[PDB]
RNA sequence: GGGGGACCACCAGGUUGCCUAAGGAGGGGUGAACCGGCCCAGGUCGGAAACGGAGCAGGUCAAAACUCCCGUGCUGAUCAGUAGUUUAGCGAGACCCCGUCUC
């Protein structure tokens, strides 16, 4: 969210002046490159995009009339999208019937994180998932994804130090194509800070086993040195894609994707963060976009608030359209405001039909005290954070009803 | 957490009356608004945890209080007028005819 702000930057260097020449857009392409150096993009590469921007759009010749800064932010979007992502979307869905996927990380890359919390996008979205821990050489990582994955009712089937990841993910797989599954991800171990070695055996696995897709996990704290990775991940396997991972603990995110672009491959999930809820599919040009440039009763209100947390995950999608304003994207490091409503929700579920059900609540708790009394035995909240709710109740429902 | 006393309200159920014009050891419901108990999701408090406490939704009633029905005794009142019994006459009159007389 800082590339976005140091091109508002450039752009906001656009405006607001009464030159335009040249020298304007030489000024303002040396604040672009400088805020991809500071992602970490190879410099080459964006002088090769600057030199494209210049040889699209130059100045010296007169298209007579014309609206002015409109094409050139479409121009730098367009040359960004040219090198960020390769096009249009890579392709999502759960591709026909049983979806073997294979998943093989880096040591550190969060390969326990990454196969845990994929999971659940498929599931929200109707589709039954089954994982395949073949992390045999990781004991603990069997225990923390054991731990991490019992609390949503996955079957596994799996044992310890059998020291055969082929025989393993072939004994899975026969397994689970027992009850008419649908996706089966297959979490694949980790060797000698990987140089050479595990991809004979990966090899190995795709002989016996012949998968449908192969998804490698990358890091955003490697850098530009992703490339003679990517080399080798690219021409072992050639229908294969990316996840980039830890978004929000590094400040060097563009730089890989700038290196997986240069490498030409589609990228299909993301991940930001450490939480569960921390995975988005890519929305690409949408993505770019949206970092540079952005009777009613008490029970209506509850489950306005159940759909507006069942629309909840959802964050990157609904927190970056045009028409929010400045002073955002942080909110204290945003958590709190969305843990408090199932808060207030518990407050609400702390009432009765007759109170949920009546025309006026706030009037009601007017005319019977009592009830705002009664829901503090139940919620456990204080009173004083009743009376604050309903405050709030009482001047939102006044701005419905004016609204 | 382990134990010794003291007091209040009630229930089951066995004997009962210095008790009634009658006083069921009946059934049901709310148990709400903080004022009965139990199980207590989520949450909260204490704790490093195990776990335990106050306990909300939700469910529950042999045992806080309230209320309804049946039975019960007093008590007005309604229904069918059911029940088993209680003109005529007289005296005068015009003209004509018949005789007499005079000129």
């Not at 923390?144 to 020291?163: C, D, V």
């Not at 027992?178 to 190995?204: A, P």
């Not at 290196?259 to 990228?267: D, F, G, L, M």
């Amino acid at each position: 969210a800082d590339l976005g702000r140091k091109i508002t930057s450039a752009l906001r260097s656009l405006s607001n002046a009464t030159i335009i020449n040249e020298e304007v857009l030489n000024a303002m392409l040396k604040e672009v490159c400088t805020a991809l150096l500071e992602a970490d993009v190879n410099i080459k590469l964006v002088k090769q995009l600057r030199e494209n921007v210049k040889s699209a759009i130059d100045l010296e010749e007169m298209a007579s009339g014309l609206n002015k800064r409109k094409m050139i932010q479409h121009a730098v979007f367009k040359e960004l999208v040219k090198l960020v992502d390769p096009g249009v979307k890579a392709w999502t869905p759960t591709k026909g019937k049983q979806n073997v996927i294979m998943f093989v990380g880096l040591q550190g890359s969060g390969k326990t994180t990454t196969c845990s919390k994929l999971a659940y996008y498929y599931q929200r979205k109707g589709w039954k998932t089954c994982l395949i821990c073949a992390d045999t050489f990781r004991a603990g990582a069997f225990d923390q994804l054991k731990q991490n994955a019992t609390k949503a009712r996955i079957p596994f089937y799996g044992s310890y130090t059998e020291m055969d990841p082929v025989i393993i993910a072939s004994e899975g797989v026969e397994k689970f194509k027992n009850e008419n599954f649908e996706i089966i991800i297959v979490d694949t171990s980790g060797r000698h800070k990987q140089e050479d070695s595990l991809f004979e055996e990966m090899l190995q696995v795709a002989n016996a086993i012949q998968p449908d897709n192969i998804v490698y996990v990358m890091d955003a704290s490697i850098g530009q040195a992703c490339e003679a990775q990517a080399k080798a991940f690219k021409d072992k396997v050639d229908v294969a894609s990316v996840i980039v991972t830890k978004l929000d603990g590094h400040a060097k995110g563009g730089g890989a994707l700038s290196a997986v672009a240069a490498t030409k491959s589609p990228i299909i999930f993301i991940g930001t963060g450490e939480h569960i809820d921390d995975f988005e599919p890519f929305k690409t040009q949408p993505f770019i976009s949206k970092l540079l440039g952005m009777q009613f009763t008490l029970r209506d209100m509850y489950e306005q608030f159940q759909n507006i947390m069942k629309m909840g995950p959802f964050s990157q999608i609904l927190g970056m359209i045009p028409g929010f304003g400045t002073d955002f994207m942080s909110k204290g490091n945003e958590q709190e405001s969305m843990a408090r409503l199932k808060k207030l929700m518990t407050i609400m579920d702390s009432m009765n039909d007759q109170e949920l059900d009546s025309t006026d609540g706030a009037k009601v708790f007017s005319k019977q005290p009592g009830r705002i009394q009664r829901v503090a035995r139940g919620s456990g909240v204080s009173t004083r954070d009743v009376q604050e709710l309903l405050t709030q109740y009482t001047k939102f429902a006044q701005m419905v009803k004016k609204m």
